[PDB]
Amino acid sequence: QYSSNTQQGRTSIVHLFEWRWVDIALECERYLAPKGFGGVQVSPPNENVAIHNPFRPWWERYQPVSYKLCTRSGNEDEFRNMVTRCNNVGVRIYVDAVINHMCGNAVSAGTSSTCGSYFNPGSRDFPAVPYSGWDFNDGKCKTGSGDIENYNDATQVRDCRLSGLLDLALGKDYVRSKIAEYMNHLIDIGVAGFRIDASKHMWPGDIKAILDKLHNLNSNWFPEGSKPFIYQEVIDLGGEPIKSSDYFGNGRVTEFKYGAKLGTVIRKWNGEKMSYLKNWGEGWGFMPSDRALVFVDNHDNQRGHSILTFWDARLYKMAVGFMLAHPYGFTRVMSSYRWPRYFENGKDVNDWVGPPNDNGVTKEVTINPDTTCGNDWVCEHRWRQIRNMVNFRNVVDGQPFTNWYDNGSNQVAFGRGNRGFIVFNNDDWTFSLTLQTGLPAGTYCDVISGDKINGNCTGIKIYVSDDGKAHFSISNSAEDPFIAIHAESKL
Ligand SMILES: C[C@H]1O[C@H](O[C@H]2[C@H](O)[C@@H](O)[C@@H](O[C@H]3[C@H](O)[C@@H](O)[C@H](O)O[C@@H]3CO)O[C@@H]2CO)[C@H](O)[C@@H](O)[C@@H]1N[C@H]1C=C(CO)[C@@H](O[C@H]2O[C@H](CO)[C@@H](O[C@H]3O[C@H](C)[C@@H](N[C@H]4C=C(CO)[C@@H](O)[C@H](O)[C@H]4O)[C@H](O)[C@H]3O)[C@H](O)[C@H]2O)[C@H](O)[C@H]1O
Ligand SMILES: C[C@H]1O[C@H](O[C@H]2[C@H](O)[C@@H](O)[C@@H](O[C@H]3[C@H](O)[C@@H](O)[C@H](O)O[C@@H]3CO)O[C@@H]2CO)[C@H](O)[C@@H](O)[C@@H]1N[C@H]1C=C(CO)[C@@H](O)[C@H](O)[C@H]1O
Ligand SMILES: C[C@H]1O[C@H](O[C@H]2[C@H](O)[C@@H](O)[C@@H](O[C@H]3[C@H](O)[C@@H](O)[C@H](O)O[C@@H]3CO)O[C@@H]2CO)[C@H](O)[C@@H](O)[C@@H]1N[C@H]1C=C(CO)[C@@H](O)[C@H](O)[C@H]1O
Ligand SMILES: [Ca+2]
Ligand SMILES: [Cl-]
């Protein structure tokens, strides 16, 4: 469960949040394959509640109605088509598995669902599965409300309703088997693994029991005996009885400390500075690198405070670039849509807004002439600075963190063996200095400011001399105050 199952030399997943299956299929072929992306995390592919108040929120997809592969992203045919076309060009699909719960307990009965399935929350009736009253934790939960009230009580965190979401009885072999049936359907289609939603709200032993029932990966694309990559969503910043480490038996775990601390550093908040990143990773009290799934922001926390997002583009690019250059963890890049933010007493009252849509119909991802996206899709994964850093990570794969420099403040650099070097200026004055890069002598294209195309650079050029040294100059007023060069950006 710890191996991503990506093609050799492909080291990142991108979350194509709320993207339609047809758009993902095309993206694999036209972009992700040739740009060396490892895979795609997809929104939940299973039927959910169509919520009309407010209007089709992104979070409706986290309220299951059945395991029918029928959503605003598309149907089962489209989903199969996407996985096949993606695997055929060496790009993997990872499913957002919502298996802790069904929908909100107070949702109205009926067929207000993305595949028209009937369901009745009040009577605990989900006949498209089927689930019935016996398949939920109503009787196991010991809180007065039936919901989670206190995170300092590990038992209710697992046995009670997360914000009133009906809590599946994962201790029952029947419930485990219905979930495994769904996950096995996806595996056989060709899915390479799973993001396990709300992992904290499940007993590690119940997750294990479900995983024990899973097939090996599809033997047309994957070597014999391949297991799904598992990365479990557990938010653990400390201070709670449940720990990320409790889930290590099942696979990797999201390291939420990662983006929280890096954002704080890059914003220069709380007295933090980039020079402190010299011992980044386990030195910052993070989980072991071989279990961490890392990211600057995710679909939840990009809607809250302190986290860096595409809204803070300049600092965001640096943070994502630092992450992609650094060997700690397995990296996931966010890909978002814009929504009509509106702040009222410091809260975004429109943080619920679903993907770009015309009366609830998801808009296609259009591609502009300059390779950016239209229709309000942000496409961070297509931003030159990020896309090129995704390749940087591939090129330097397996090389050691080395040649660290800092000015004691916010001017830092480091290399990856003899294959890549990166330089950051986050201070309020100019970074002008000759540094040991660890690289062979040559002219290198800065892949942040530009591209190598045939035999020239479209941006900055760095000149590495015979002793591996090169001069860097980065103004503090630079639009992208960082430079990165690697073995494949050499002229
Ligand atoms: C979203 C996230 O929530 C949980 O995370 C906890 C975390 O475990 C805690 O440690 C802690 O963390 C804080 C920490 O304390 C801070 O100090 C630190 O700085 O920041 C962190 C936060 O980053 O708090 C957080 C937040 O509570 C889960 O542990 C985690 O798994 C969650 N992420 C997941 C899971 C889900 C669930 O599938 C997805 O959730 C999203 O979708 C749901 C469902 O649609 C949506 O909720 C909506 O629907 C509800 C039914 C509704 N409820 C109301 C109705 C009631 C009547 O029945 C009431 O009973 C109830 O109380 C009402 O609130 C919600 O209002 C409505 O919004 C979620 O909002 C949405 O996020 C995530 O996307 C997925 O990634
Ligand atoms: C282990 C520790 O890691 C992180 O701490 C960072 C600091 O946030 C950062 O400012 C910097 O701290 C000093 C640095 O170590 C030192 O070399 C430099 O000269 O001065 C810096 C402060 O001015 O670097 C450290 C990591 O080296 C996290 O932010 C911390 O939360 C984290 N602490 C841990 C460890 C313990 C055990 O004592 C608990 O207190 C806490 O629960 C846990 O999170
Ligand atoms: C492909 C493209 O990537 C990069 O562009 C990013 C910005 O760097 C990023 O900050 C963000 O810009 C938004 C900005 O923050 C805000 O002021 C404004 O309201 O909205 C902007 C988006 O419209 O997003 C864009 C991408 O959408 C580079 O900075 C661009 O130079 C880069 N274009 C290049 C690169 C290539 C090939 O690598 C060519 O295809 C393209 O023609 C060329 O212009
Ligand atoms: Ca639960
Ligand atoms: Cl996540």
Side-chain angles (χ1 to χ4, degrees), residues 47-69:
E47 176 179 27
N48 59 271
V49 176
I51 292 180
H52 281 83
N53 278 103
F55 192 70
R56 312 310 305 274
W58 60 267
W59 51 249
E60 80 167 38
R61 302 190 67 160
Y62 294 90
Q63 303 193 27
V65 168
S66 75
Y67 302 120
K68 292 173 180 178
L69 301 182

PDB file of all heavy atoms in Angstrom, residues 47-69:
ATOM      1  N   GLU A  47     -22.144   7.884  -6.655  1.00  0.00           N
ATOM      2  CA  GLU A  47     -23.352   8.701  -6.599  1.00  0.00           C
ATOM      3  C   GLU A  47     -23.504   9.423  -5.270  1.00  0.00           C
ATOM      4  O   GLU A  47     -23.320   8.851  -4.193  1.00  0.00           O
ATOM      5  CB  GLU A  47     -24.598   7.832  -6.885  1.00  0.00           C
ATOM      6  CG  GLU A  47     -25.924   8.582  -6.752  1.00  0.00           C
ATOM      7  CD  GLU A  47     -27.125   7.703  -7.076  1.00  0.00           C
ATOM      8  OE1 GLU A  47     -27.030   6.470  -6.894  1.00  0.00           O
ATOM      9  OE2 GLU A  47     -28.161   8.246  -7.508  1.00  0.00           O
ATOM     10  N   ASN A  48     -23.888  10.689  -5.348  1.00  0.00           N
ATOM     11  CA  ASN A  48     -24.031  11.489  -4.146  1.00  0.00           C
ATOM     12  C   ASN A  48     -25.379  12.231  -4.121  1.00  0.00           C
ATOM     13  O   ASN A  48     -26.147  12.156  -5.071  1.00  0.00           O
ATOM     14  CB  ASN A  48     -22.855  12.485  -4.037  1.00  0.00           C
ATOM     15  CG  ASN A  48     -22.765  13.415  -5.241  1.00  0.00           C
ATOM     16  OD1 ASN A  48     -22.101  13.104  -6.255  1.00  0.00           O
ATOM     17  ND2 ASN A  48     -23.428  14.564  -5.147  1.00  0.00           N
ATOM     18  N   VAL A  49     -25.650  12.926  -3.021  1.00  0.00           N
ATOM     19  CA  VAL A  49     -26.857  13.743  -2.905  1.00  0.00           C
ATOM     20  C   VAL A  49     -26.727  14.993  -3.802  1.00  0.00           C
ATOM     21  O   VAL A  49     -25.700  15.665  -3.777  1.00  0.00           O
ATOM     22  CB  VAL A  49     -27.112  14.168  -1.443  1.00  0.00           C
ATOM     23  CG1 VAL A  49     -28.328  15.102  -1.359  1.00  0.00           C
ATOM     24  CG2 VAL A  49     -27.315  12.957  -0.562  1.00  0.00           C
ATOM     25  N   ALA A  50     -27.740  15.263  -4.619  1.00  0.00           N
ATOM     26  CA  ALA A  50     -27.828  16.542  -5.320  1.00  0.00           C
ATOM     27  C   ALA A  50     -28.448  17.512  -4.311  1.00  0.00           C
ATOM     28  O   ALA A  50     -29.621  17.362  -3.926  1.00  0.00           O
ATOM     29  CB  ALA A  50     -28.677  16.430  -6.575  1.00  0.00           C
ATOM     30  N   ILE A  51     -27.629  18.454  -3.844  1.00  0.00           N
ATOM     31  CA  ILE A  51     -28.013  19.418  -2.817  1.00  0.00           C
ATOM     32  C   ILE A  51     -28.346  20.735  -3.508  1.00  0.00           C
ATOM     33  O   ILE A  51     -27.538  21.257  -4.279  1.00  0.00           O
ATOM     34  CB  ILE A  51     -26.837  19.597  -1.850  1.00  0.00           C
ATOM     35  CG1 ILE A  51     -26.644  18.299  -1.074  1.00  0.00           C
ATOM     36  CG2 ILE A  51     -27.021  20.838  -0.913  1.00  0.00           C
ATOM     37  CD1 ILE A  51     -25.538  18.348  -0.113  1.00  0.00           C
ATOM     38  N   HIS A  52     -29.535  21.272  -3.256  1.00  0.00           N
ATOM     39  CA  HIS A  52     -29.921  22.477  -3.981  1.00  0.00           C
ATOM     40  C   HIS A  52     -29.884  23.757  -3.141  1.00  0.00           C
ATOM     41  O   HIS A  52     -29.918  24.867  -3.685  1.00  0.00           O
ATOM     42  CB  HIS A  52     -31.240  22.291  -4.747  1.00  0.00           C
ATOM     43  CG  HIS A  52     -31.076  21.533  -6.033  1.00  0.00           C
ATOM     44  ND1 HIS A  52     -31.051  20.154  -6.088  1.00  0.00           N
ATOM     45  CD2 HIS A  52     -30.889  21.961  -7.307  1.00  0.00           C
ATOM     46  CE1 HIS A  52     -30.876  19.768  -7.339  1.00  0.00           C
ATOM     47  NE2 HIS A  52     -30.781  20.846  -8.098  1.00  0.00           N
ATOM     48  N   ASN A  53     -29.766  23.589  -1.827  1.00  0.00           N
ATOM     49  CA  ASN A  53     -29.486  24.694  -0.903  1.00  0.00           C
ATOM     50  C   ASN A  53     -28.242  24.386  -0.081  1.00  0.00           C
ATOM     51  O   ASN A  53     -28.283  23.468   0.752  1.00  0.00           O
ATOM     52  CB  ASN A  53     -30.662  24.899   0.054  1.00  0.00           C
ATOM     53  CG  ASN A  53     -31.764  25.720  -0.559  1.00  0.00           C
ATOM     54  OD1 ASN A  53     -32.798  25.190  -0.968  1.00  0.00           O
ATOM     55  ND2 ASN A  53     -31.554  27.010  -0.631  1.00  0.00           N
ATOM     56  N   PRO A  54     -27.128  25.079  -0.325  1.00  0.00           N
ATOM     57  CA  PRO A  54     -26.999  26.058  -1.410  1.00  0.00           C
ATOM     58  C   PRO A  54     -26.846  25.328  -2.755  1.00  0.00           C
ATOM     59  O   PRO A  54     -26.968  24.088  -2.788  1.00  0.00           O
ATOM     60  CB  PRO A  54     -25.736  26.831  -1.028  1.00  0.00           C
ATOM     61  CG  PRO A  54     -24.881  25.777  -0.293  1.00  0.00           C
ATOM     62  CD  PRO A  54     -25.867  24.898   0.423  1.00  0.00           C
ATOM     63  N   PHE A  55     -26.607  26.069  -3.832  1.00  0.00           N
ATOM     64  CA  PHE A  55     -26.720  25.492  -5.167  1.00  0.00           C
ATOM     65  C   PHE A  55     -25.533  24.626  -5.569  1.00  0.00           C
ATOM     66  O   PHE A  55     -24.495  25.159  -5.981  1.00  0.00           O
ATOM     67  CB  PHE A  55     -26.959  26.571  -6.236  1.00  0.00           C
ATOM     68  CG  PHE A  55     -27.366  26.001  -7.566  1.00  0.00           C
ATOM     69  CD1 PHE A  55     -28.624  25.408  -7.735  1.00  0.00           C
ATOM     70  CD2 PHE A  55     -26.474  26.008  -8.641  1.00  0.00           C
ATOM     71  CE1 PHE A  55     -28.989  24.867  -8.970  1.00  0.00           C
ATOM     72  CE2 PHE A  55     -26.831  25.475  -9.874  1.00  0.00           C
ATOM     73  CZ  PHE A  55     -28.085  24.901 -10.042  1.00  0.00           C
ATOM     74  N   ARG A  56     -25.697  23.306  -5.446  1.00  0.00           N
ATOM     75  CA  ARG A  56     -24.692  22.334  -5.939  1.00  0.00           C
ATOM     76  C   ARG A  56     -23.262  22.581  -5.383  1.00  0.00           C
ATOM     77  O   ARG A  56     -22.280  22.733  -6.162  1.00  0.00           O
ATOM     78  CB  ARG A  56     -24.694  22.286  -7.471  1.00  0.00           C
ATOM     79  CG  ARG A  56     -26.107  22.145  -8.126  1.00  0.00           C
ATOM     80  CD  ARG A  56     -27.009  21.009  -7.569  1.00  0.00           C
ATOM     81  NE  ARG A  56     -26.393  19.674  -7.613  1.00  0.00           N
ATOM     82  CZ  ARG A  56     -26.414  18.841  -8.662  1.00  0.00           C
ATOM     83  NH1 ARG A  56     -27.045  19.170  -9.792  1.00  0.00           N
ATOM     84  NH2 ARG A  56     -25.803  17.652  -8.570  1.00  0.00           N
ATOM     85  N   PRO A  57     -23.144  22.577  -4.051  1.00  0.00           N
ATOM     86  CA  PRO A  57     -21.867  22.864  -3.392  1.00  0.00           C
ATOM     87  C   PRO A  57     -20.866  21.766  -3.729  1.00  0.00           C
ATOM     88  O   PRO A  57     -21.266  20.615  -3.985  1.00  0.00           O
ATOM     89  CB  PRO A  57     -22.211  22.765  -1.894  1.00  0.00           C
ATOM     90  CG  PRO A  57     -23.439  21.882  -1.821  1.00  0.00           C
ATOM     91  CD  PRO A  57     -24.187  22.186  -3.077  1.00  0.00           C
ATOM     92  N   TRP A  58     -19.577  22.087  -3.690  1.00  0.00           N
ATOM     93  CA  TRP A  58     -18.572  21.042  -3.900  1.00  0.00           C
ATOM     94  C   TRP A  58     -18.767  19.954  -2.861  1.00  0.00           C
ATOM     95  O   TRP A  58     -18.566  18.764  -3.141  1.00  0.00           O
ATOM     96  CB  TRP A  58     -17.156  21.597  -3.838  1.00  0.00           C
ATOM     97  CG  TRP A  58     -16.819  22.215  -2.554  1.00  0.00           C
ATOM     98  CD1 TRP A  58     -16.934  23.540  -2.219  1.00  0.00           C
ATOM     99  CD2 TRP A  58     -16.293  21.556  -1.410  1.00  0.00           C
ATOM    100  NE1 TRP A  58     -16.519  23.734  -0.921  1.00  0.00           N
ATOM    101  CE2 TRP A  58     -16.112  22.531  -0.404  1.00  0.00           C
ATOM    102  CE3 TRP A  58     -15.943  20.227  -1.129  1.00  0.00           C
ATOM    103  CZ2 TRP A  58     -15.609  22.217   0.863  1.00  0.00           C
ATOM    104  CZ3 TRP A  58     -15.451  19.914   0.108  1.00  0.00           C
ATOM    105  CH2 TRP A  58     -15.291  20.907   1.104  1.00  0.00           C
ATOM    106  N   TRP A  59     -19.197  20.335  -1.666  1.00  0.00           N
ATOM    107  CA  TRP A  59     -19.265  19.334  -0.599  1.00  0.00           C
ATOM    108  C   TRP A  59     -20.422  18.314  -0.675  1.00  0.00           C
ATOM    109  O   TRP A  59     -20.452  17.352   0.092  1.00  0.00           O
ATOM    110  CB  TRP A  59     -19.091  19.961   0.781  1.00  0.00           C
ATOM    111  CG  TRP A  59     -19.974  21.135   1.096  1.00  0.00           C
ATOM    112  CD1 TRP A  59     -19.576  22.442   1.252  1.00  0.00           C
ATOM    113  CD2 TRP A  59     -21.386  21.116   1.353  1.00  0.00           C
ATOM    114  NE1 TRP A  59     -20.656  23.233   1.577  1.00  0.00           N
ATOM    115  CE2 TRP A  59     -21.778  22.446   1.650  1.00  0.00           C
ATOM    116  CE3 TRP A  59     -22.368  20.107   1.374  1.00  0.00           C
ATOM    117  CZ2 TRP A  59     -23.107  22.792   1.960  1.00  0.00           C
ATOM    118  CZ3 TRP A  59     -23.681  20.453   1.686  1.00  0.00           C
ATOM    119  CH2 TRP A  59     -24.040  21.787   1.968  1.00  0.00           C
ATOM    120  N   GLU A  60     -21.331  18.475  -1.633  1.00  0.00           N
ATOM    121  CA  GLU A  60     -22.367  17.456  -1.882  1.00  0.00           C
ATOM    122  C   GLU A  60     -21.755  16.093  -2.263  1.00  0.00           C
ATOM    123  O   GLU A  60     -22.316  15.047  -1.940  1.00  0.00           O
ATOM    124  CB  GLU A  60     -23.397  17.928  -2.938  1.00  0.00           C
ATOM    125  CG  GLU A  60     -22.954  17.793  -4.395  1.00  0.00           C
ATOM    126  CD  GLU A  60     -24.077  17.955  -5.415  1.00  0.00           C
ATOM    127  OE1 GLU A  60     -24.973  18.819  -5.208  1.00  0.00           O
ATOM    128  OE2 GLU A  60     -24.028  17.252  -6.470  1.00  0.00           O
ATOM    129  N   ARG A  61     -20.589  16.113  -2.928  1.00  0.00           N
ATOM    130  CA  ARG A  61     -19.878  14.883  -3.295  1.00  0.00           C
ATOM    131  C   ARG A  61     -19.328  14.063  -2.125  1.00  0.00           C
ATOM    132  O   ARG A  61     -18.885  12.906  -2.313  1.00  0.00           O
ATOM    133  CB  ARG A  61     -18.773  15.193  -4.314  1.00  0.00           C
ATOM    134  CG  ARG A  61     -19.345  15.845  -5.575  1.00  0.00           C
ATOM    135  CD  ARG A  61     -18.383  15.987  -6.737  1.00  0.00           C
ATOM    136  NE  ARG A  61     -17.977  14.693  -7.337  1.00  0.00           N
ATOM    137  CZ  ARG A  61     -17.473  14.586  -8.558  1.00  0.00           C
ATOM    138  NH1 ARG A  61     -17.277  15.684  -9.294  1.00  0.00           N
ATOM    139  NH2 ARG A  61     -17.119  13.397  -9.035  1.00  0.00           N
ATOM    140  N   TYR A  62     -19.353  14.642  -0.925  1.00  0.00           N
ATOM    141  CA  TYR A  62     -18.946  13.927   0.281  1.00  0.00           C
ATOM    142  C   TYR A  62     -20.158  13.378   1.050  1.00  0.00           C
ATOM    143  O   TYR A  62     -20.022  12.966   2.206  1.00  0.00           O
ATOM    144  CB  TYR A  62     -18.001  14.798   1.144  1.00  0.00           C
ATOM    145  CG  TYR A  62     -16.726  15.013   0.375  1.00  0.00           C
ATOM    146  CD1 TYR A  62     -16.586  16.098  -0.488  1.00  0.00           C
ATOM    147  CD2 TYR A  62     -15.716  14.053   0.406  1.00  0.00           C
ATOM    148  CE1 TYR A  62     -15.425  16.249  -1.272  1.00  0.00           C
ATOM    149  CE2 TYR A  62     -14.561  14.186  -0.375  1.00  0.00           C
ATOM    150  CZ  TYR A  62     -14.424  15.276  -1.207  1.00  0.00           C
ATOM    151  OH  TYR A  62     -13.278  15.402  -1.970  1.00  0.00           O
ATOM    152  N   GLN A  63     -21.316  13.324   0.374  1.00  0.00           N
ATOM    153  CA  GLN A  63     -22.530  12.684   0.932  1.00  0.00           C
ATOM    154  C   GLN A  63     -23.063  11.598  -0.012  1.00  0.00           C
ATOM    155  O   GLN A  63     -23.893  11.875  -0.887  1.00  0.00           O
ATOM    156  CB  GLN A  63     -23.614  13.736   1.190  1.00  0.00           C
ATOM    157  CG  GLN A  63     -23.159  14.870   2.120  1.00  0.00           C
ATOM    158  CD  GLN A  63     -24.316  15.717   2.624  1.00  0.00           C
ATOM    159  OE1 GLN A  63     -25.440  15.229   2.726  1.00  0.00           O
ATOM    160  NE2 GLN A  63     -24.046  16.991   2.921  1.00  0.00           N
ATOM    161  N   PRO A  64     -22.532  10.385   0.121  1.00  0.00           N
ATOM    162  CA  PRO A  64     -22.887   9.273  -0.759  1.00  0.00           C
ATOM    163  C   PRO A  64     -24.366   8.853  -0.678  1.00  0.00           C
ATOM    164  O   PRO A  64     -25.011   8.954   0.397  1.00  0.00           O
ATOM    165  CB  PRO A  64     -21.989   8.154  -0.258  1.00  0.00           C
ATOM    166  CG  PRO A  64     -20.822   8.890   0.370  1.00  0.00           C
ATOM    167  CD  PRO A  64     -21.502   9.993   1.100  1.00  0.00           C
ATOM    168  N   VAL A  65     -24.871   8.399  -1.824  1.00  0.00           N
ATOM    169  CA  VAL A  65     -26.211   7.802  -1.964  1.00  0.00           C
ATOM    170  C   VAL A  65     -26.109   6.334  -2.380  1.00  0.00           C
ATOM    171  O   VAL A  65     -26.943   5.496  -1.987  1.00  0.00           O
ATOM    172  CB  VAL A  65     -27.086   8.628  -2.964  1.00  0.00           C
ATOM    173  CG1 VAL A  65     -28.364   7.885  -3.357  1.00  0.00           C
ATOM    174  CG2 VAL A  65     -27.438   9.965  -2.319  1.00  0.00           C
ATOM    175  N   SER A  66     -25.095   6.022  -3.185  1.00  0.00           N
ATOM    176  CA  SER A  66     -24.787   4.635  -3.547  1.00  0.00           C
ATOM    177  C   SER A  66     -23.343   4.501  -4.037  1.00  0.00           C
ATOM    178  O   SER A  66     -22.548   5.459  -3.942  1.00  0.00           O
ATOM    179  CB  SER A  66     -25.751   4.125  -4.617  1.00  0.00           C
ATOM    180  OG  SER A  66     -25.446   4.656  -5.896  1.00  0.00           O
ATOM    181  N   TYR A  67     -23.007   3.325  -4.566  1.00  0.00           N
ATOM    182  CA  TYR A  67     -21.690   3.123  -5.160  1.00  0.00           C
ATOM    183  C   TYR A  67     -21.758   3.048  -6.677  1.00  0.00           C
ATOM    184  O   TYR A  67     -20.805   2.612  -7.323  1.00  0.00           O
ATOM    185  CB  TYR A  67     -20.971   1.926  -4.512  1.00  0.00           C
ATOM    186  CG  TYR A  67     -20.819   2.125  -3.039  1.00  0.00           C
ATOM    187  CD1 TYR A  67     -21.380   1.228  -2.134  1.00  0.00           C
ATOM    188  CD2 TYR A  67     -20.167   3.257  -2.533  1.00  0.00           C
ATOM    189  CE1 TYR A  67     -21.271   1.428  -0.761  1.00  0.00           C
ATOM    190  CE2 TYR A  67     -20.066   3.472  -1.163  1.00  0.00           C
ATOM    191  CZ  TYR A  67     -20.604   2.552  -0.281  1.00  0.00           C
ATOM    192  OH  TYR A  67     -20.489   2.758   1.090  1.00  0.00           O
ATOM    193  N   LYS A  68     -22.885   3.501  -7.244  1.00  0.00           N
ATOM    194  CA  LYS A  68     -23.025   3.661  -8.686  1.00  0.00           C
ATOM    195  C   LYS A  68     -22.071   4.774  -9.147  1.00  0.00           C
ATOM    196  O   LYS A  68     -21.965   5.833  -8.496  1.00  0.00           O
ATOM    197  CB  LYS A  68     -24.456   4.047  -9.065  1.00  0.00           C
ATOM    198  CG  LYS A  68     -25.522   2.964  -8.827  1.00  0.00           C
ATOM    199  CD  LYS A  68     -26.894   3.554  -9.089  1.00  0.00           C
ATOM    200  CE  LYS A  68     -28.016   2.538  -8.876  1.00  0.00           C
ATOM    201  NZ  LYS A  68     -29.349   3.211  -9.097  1.00  0.00           N
ATOM    202  N   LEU A  69     -21.381   4.539 -10.262  1.00  0.00           N
ATOM    203  CA  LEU A  69     -20.348   5.467 -10.711  1.00  0.00           C
ATOM    204  C   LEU A  69     -20.993   6.502 -11.599  1.00  0.00           C
ATOM    205  O   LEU A  69     -20.815   6.490 -12.813  1.00  0.00           O
ATOM    206  CB  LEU A  69     -19.215   4.728 -11.433  1.00  0.00           C
ATOM    207  CG  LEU A  69     -18.502   3.662 -10.587  1.00  0.00           C
ATOM    208  CD1 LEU A  69     -17.362   3.019 -11.371  1.00  0.00           C
ATOM    209  CD2 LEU A  69     -17.977   4.224  -9.252  1.00  0.00           C
TER     210      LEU A  69
END
